[PDB]
């Protein structure tokens, strides 16, 4: 398997097959392995980036996950004052196997490449959680806060979807 983005070492986590062939996907079990500290001696810090809209996040998110659905907010939190180290890992996810997580992963890479001299990166190791929150929640509910799941296309949240889409850079 290939080396990470800055070509310093291999990808630490075991991968699974996903929609986007050029991106690295991880299973819910691997996400729990990270959260339980099985890689604590190698991983300094990791950020779970929930790319869903605020209402989806508020209705149930993975513990310690940061809500960064907008590109400018994701770039501000991650790249204005970078999380320096051991390894730094980023995990992006959305609801299921949609485009929000993968698109944010590619964006952060594009901006990470732009603010650095090739091939150095602030975030060389980035993954996508396979199945997103929809597959994580029924497997590990106690690793979620609150213990609920609010879909994007929830009946009572049609206006909230609309209001938030109008805050995005492109559609
Ligand atoms: Cl955006």
Swiss-Prot record:
Example GO biological process: G2/M transition of mitotic cell cycle
CC annotations in GO: centrosome; cytoplasm; cytosol; nucleoplasm; nucleus; spindle pole
Keyword line: Cell cycle, Cell division, Cytoplasm, Cytoskeleton, Hydrolase, Mitosis, Phosphoprotein, Protein phosphatase
The record's account of how the chain is modified after translation: Phosphorylated by BRSK1 in vitro. Phosphorylated by CHEK1, which inhibits the activity of this protein.
Compartments reported by the entry: Cytoplasm, Cytoskeleton, Microtubule organizing center, Centrosome; Cytoplasm, Cytoskeleton, Spindle pole
GO molecular function: phosphoprotein phosphatase activity; protein kinase binding; protein tyrosine phosphatase activity
Coiled-coil regions, chain positions: none
Record bears the keyword NADP: no
Domain Rhodanese: 42-145
Active site: 94
Modified residues annotated as Phosphoserine in this record: 81, 170
Tree of life domain: Eukaryota
Stated role: Tyrosine protein phosphatase which functions as a dosage-dependent inducer of mitotic progression. Directly dephosphorylates CDK1 and stimulates its kinase activity. Required for G2/M phases of the cell cycle progression and abscission during cytokinesis in a ECT2-dependent manner. The three isoforms seem to have a different level of activity.
Subunit structure as annotated in this protein's UniProt entry: Interacts with MAPK14 and 14-3-3 proteins.
Family as reported in the entry's similarity comment: Belongs to the MPI phosphatase family.
Protein name: M-phase inducer phosphatase 2
Organism: Homo sapiens
Taxonomic lineage: Eukaryota, Metazoa, Chordata, Craniata, Vertebrata
Whole sequence portion shown: 391 to 564 of 580
